[PDB]
Write a protein that binds this ligand. Sequence first.
Ligand SMILES: *[C@@H]1O[C@H](CO)[C@@H](O[C@@H]2O[C@H](CO)[C@@H](O[C@@H]3O[C@H](CO)[C@@H](O)[C@H](O[C@H]4O[C@H](CO)[C@@H](O)[C@H](O)[C@@H]4O)[C@@H]3O)[C@H](O)[C@H]2NC(C)=O)[C@H](O)[C@H]1NC(C)=O
Ligand SMILES: *[C@@H]1O[C@H](CO)[C@@H](O[C@@H]2O[C@H](CO)[C@@H](O)[C@H](O)[C@H]2NC(C)=O)[C@H](O)[C@H]1NC(C)=O
Ligand SMILES: *[C@@H]1O[C@H](CO)[C@@H](O)[C@H](O)[C@H]1NC(C)=O
Ligand SMILES: *[C@@H]1O[C@H](CO)[C@@H](O)[C@H](O)[C@H]1NC(C)=O
Lengths: 302, 510, 293, 144
Amino acid sequence: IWELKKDVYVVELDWYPDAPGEMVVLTCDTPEEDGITWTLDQSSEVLGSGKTLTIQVKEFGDAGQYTCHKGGEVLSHSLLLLHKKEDGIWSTDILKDQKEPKNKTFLRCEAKNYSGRFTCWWLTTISTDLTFSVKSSRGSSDPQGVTCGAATLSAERVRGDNKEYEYSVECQEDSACPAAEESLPIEVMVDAVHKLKYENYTSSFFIRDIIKPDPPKNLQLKPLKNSRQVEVSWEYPDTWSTPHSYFSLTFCVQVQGKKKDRVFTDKTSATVICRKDASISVRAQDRYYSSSWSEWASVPCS
Amino acid sequence: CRTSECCFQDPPYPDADSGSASGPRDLRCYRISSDRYECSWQYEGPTAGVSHFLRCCLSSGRCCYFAAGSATRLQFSDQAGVSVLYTVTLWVESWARNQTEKSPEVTLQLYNSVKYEPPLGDIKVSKLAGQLRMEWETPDNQVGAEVQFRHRTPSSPWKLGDCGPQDDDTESCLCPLEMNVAQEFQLRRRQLSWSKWSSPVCVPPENPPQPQVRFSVEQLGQDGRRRLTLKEQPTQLELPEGCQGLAPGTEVTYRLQLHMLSCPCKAKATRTLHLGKMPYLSGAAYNVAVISSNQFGPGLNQTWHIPADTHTEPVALNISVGTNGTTMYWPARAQSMTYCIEWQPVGQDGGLATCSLTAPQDPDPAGMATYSWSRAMGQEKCYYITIFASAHPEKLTLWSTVLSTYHFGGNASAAGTPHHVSVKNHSLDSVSVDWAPSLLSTCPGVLKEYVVRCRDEDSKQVSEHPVQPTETQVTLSGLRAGVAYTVQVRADTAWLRGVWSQPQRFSIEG
Amino acid sequence: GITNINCSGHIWVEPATIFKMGMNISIYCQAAIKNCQPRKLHFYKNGIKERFQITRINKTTARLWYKNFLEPHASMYCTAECPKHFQETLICGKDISSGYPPDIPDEVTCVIYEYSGNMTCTWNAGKLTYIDTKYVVHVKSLETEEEQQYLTSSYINISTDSLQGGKKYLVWVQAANALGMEESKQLQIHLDDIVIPSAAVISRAETINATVPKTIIYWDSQTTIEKVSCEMRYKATTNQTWNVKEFDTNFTYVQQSEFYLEPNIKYVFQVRCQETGKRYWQPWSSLFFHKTP
Amino acid sequence: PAWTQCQQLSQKLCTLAWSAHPMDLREEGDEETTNDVPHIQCGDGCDPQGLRDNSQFCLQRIHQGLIFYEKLLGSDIFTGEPSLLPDSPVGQLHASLLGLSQLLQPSPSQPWQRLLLRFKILRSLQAFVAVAARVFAHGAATLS
Ligand SMILES: *[C@@H]1O[C@H](CO)[C@@H](O[C@@H]2O[C@H](CO)[C@@H](O[C@@H]3O[C@H](CO)[C@@H](O)[C@H](O[C@H]4O[C@H](CO)[C@@H](O)[C@H](O)[C@@H]4O)[C@@H]3O)[C@H](O)[C@H]2NC(C)=O)[C@H](O)[C@H]1NC(C)=O
Ligand SMILES: *[C@@H]1O[C@H](CO)[C@@H](O[C@@H]2O[C@H](CO)[C@@H](O)[C@H](O)[C@H]2NC(C)=O)[C@H](O)[C@H]1NC(C)=O
Ligand SMILES: *[C@@H]1O[C@H](CO)[C@@H](O)[C@H](O)[C@H]1NC(C)=O
Ligand SMILES: *[C@@H]1O[C@H](CO)[C@@H](O)[C@H](O)[C@H]1NC(C)=O
């Protein structure tokens, strides 16, 4: 048993049939010594008496909000969140497994630019009583300052017989240096809590590893007169870092319609040929460190 | 209280004293996920206004119930209060027409009652070390299963076998493989209750069948093209009864590969097409190959050879031999046409045609196309010449034949001079003029006609008469005995008059 | 560490890291990671995960079993998946080599070469052992019972003036490697008999136009041995059979020899010689091509 | 310095280092890289403001890192067995590194350790060559 938050305790359990559980002692936070009664959750039945309480935590029915009373008044609280340990492997029930790019990938984080802002998405099929709490830091031997806001809901979708909920959180590095060479990585630590079941996750990365620049901005096409050849013109994405002569982006251009066109231009313009009812589609990638490609932003050939 | 939470209060109906035969039965509860369980039962009799309830009683003795409504099954998670690490007692209570009907009690540990599911249709297939290998991803939270398979051919019944223990993220199963018949395979699992048999897995033969197809080619049109046509379609593969119309991934794919034998000086002369898209061909020679393939690879291919057209057309082909090279002139067909010229020496059985490719050409002021080469067509020889052209040289199916004819290289006028010319006395007033066929006769369409010249030496009178190109013997009549005469013969072409043979002097003695 | 790899356990292979080619081996990786139980072990071969045929005997140690291991060299290291860590964790690794025990060496011969001051010895190697094999040459005297040992990866020479312990000696070679060791048969040598003269070279060849065409072949050897017998092979370029004749030659001058050969036919010639009566012969001389007029 | 040639050869360096190592294994006990590998930290003046203020500070660190990575790429890790192909991109990496260091300022291991060591060295090399190519890219368009 250990402390997670103020007046919230996490009890570990070995999750095998007919388990012996764990031994747990509860102590009311009061200078008083006599006339103390205890109840579990909203039930009014008295479980025990005295300053100390001993229970044996065997299942979710024995966990819940414990309250000590004296004189008919609420003294303090003590919540018990279980933490299943299945043959040495902890449970991952709450957060849905994305399985990309590898298995057990629960938190997926991305950054638009190099300034030090990332954002982590995680999927679940649980609608009510769900409460996340994110904290993060850079390194573990001597941590630095990275601040994360509250975790909100971004979008909701339906897949299969169940639903699916997508959360997100915005984090900023406090001492961000966009130009340095990273040596030690960032840690993200999510504490997923659902009713009385506690879980907890971790992801580590380099900022240069999770960069996915925005789709290229302001796509305009002007073909040669009476010619199918079209020169492509665009500009660097707005959210990308500055100056653009330092943080350089190598692009990609395809022509799709309903014969494959693939060109990678380091210049903001290129020329291709559009077939009938085709679409010019553009990508982007950081030129020097191959982190990731961008989503296509397109306009159609007419 | 809630849809997924047990209520630890009394059911709002009295207990069952009726004991009617019709009611809930066969209550089984399995664990479907890491924290979700389901319980299913069957109801006997009419379902007119029947509400079922699932009841549970923990080890401590406190009893709770779920409000299943009119559904025949219910789902709940481990936080509902139903104990999952211990011993619980579950029984179904149904309310109908103002009566209660209970079910036989079942006592189990819900964390242990796990039912395993067969693979979810996505089974990989492969050939390894002479035996068929199939791999499937493991179902979620269902590791550690004994897996057992059954298989059959079109002519054999089910045969049962074992694959071995499975304890990974993806499973595997080693199975024998048939050579020409397909197989059906069905699969089931059980943890270290046996699962239901899978959806069918169908396996095609390791070697695809030979493409049993027949082709036909049209006659060469005036546009210089002919179309290829399929006379017979490939025979269908024999599949087991359970695989007929099932498993589109076991189908044989057929591809048509075209190889243009003419214009070998071109960069690319091969193209692959679908058997459903029949191509247009020129008067050139082509090789057509059909390749059959399946998930294991390609089978044996069949190739058909299409010969070149032998028809000769009288086209105005002018060839000029200069001090620096030879130039060809012929009527242009259309604008921006790329021409490929092929010539073969006559009498050279199996000799490869010399290929010459031109840049795209437009008709000149005289409406002619031209090609020049350095000092090359050997001199004093006959060549069979065929010209092809295309406005889209990259598309082999758009090439067309421009002309096909024979041409004599070099000085046709000098080399075409009739040889072995002889004059023999036939009568007191006639002579026989016999000669050997000129070299031009060996070039079809080049020799237009012969001309015979007779000169009376005493009167100096000269007479000329044309002779057919197939005749090398003529009898000249109406001559005077005792007079000296001179005779010469020449071979004329479609454009130039030949050189006269050496003058033969003769006189009629008798 | 960018310069070092830290092992986090140990690994051993049965029967041994060195074993006979093609046998059945078993690799036991025992993960010793602190504060972690290994979720999944993940063997690798030269950076390629061989996923098939693994058995999880027990939580710390999994076994990978090979059938017909046919690689001369392979790098094998085992990795692990910790429940909390994202990347696989390296346990340790080992390098294994497979080969054959050495064959028995035969065909032992030794020759002194004229003017060389050396005895040269050679012996056959047998089948390819695929591993480091070393040859030890033992040279024991029959007169003083003194033995001289020598080492090579292939062949060796013994200087003539080290064999002062008499004239009757005994030579045999010993082949050694990790998977076995075998000894050759003992070869009896005497230094007078094993002398081979200096190499004989053909100089030229001319044909004389006589009543019968006579072809003379001109050749010499720089030996100082008085008694020398030789053999020579001559044949047409279109024929497969060899024709050899015997000579007794004194090399004070260039020896001459006549031949009656067919005209307009190219022939080829080679020579070999020996000290008369001795066991060994010279190798056949390089090929000389001559065409009769 | 010769900014244009340095920029184009550093582009060559980036694409070569990403052709050499296009995957992951964790060695326990690694908490103190310290002075094992020189890195371009914040405060070495390799940001654009540092370039426009004083390039010498950044180029000093870049040259030290470059010579360190040539020393690593020239040791027995990349020359010893399993011997790499001379036509393989790894051999080109050392030549390009020597070129860059020239244009700027005129333990034994087992055969199984070397695969992992090569992967971890290429992983560090890509991360350093990225910032090197960036600082050379910014110079050839502003400090011409
Ligand atoms: C993610 O989940 C894991 C698994 O639950 C969790 O690991 C656990 O962390 C707690 C707290 O860090 C560990 O408990 C500690 O154990 C040490 C070792 O003896 C004790 O010294 C600690 O005692 C302090 O805290 C007590 C309670 O607050 C006090 O009573 C005491 O006086 C000390 O102040 C403490 O008990 C626990 O051992 C691990 N579990 C395992 C299996 O190691 C991890 O922390 C979670 N991480 C995140 C970021 O959420
Ligand atoms: C035994 O003696 C012979 C004769 O000297 C050696 O052969 C020569 O070796 C040197 C050194 O490698 C070469 O440069 C010569 O080309 C060799 N000559 C011939 C004719 O092969 C032989 O190497 C000696 N044996 C050993 C083991 O050193
Ligand atoms: C696990 O397996 C290894 C190898 O089979 C064995 O030596 C060991 O005793 C087993 N048990 C433990 C606790 O390591
Ligand atoms: C004798 O042998 C040694 C090596 O065994 C060699 O170096 C030397 O050259 C040889 N002598 C002659 C004359 O070749």
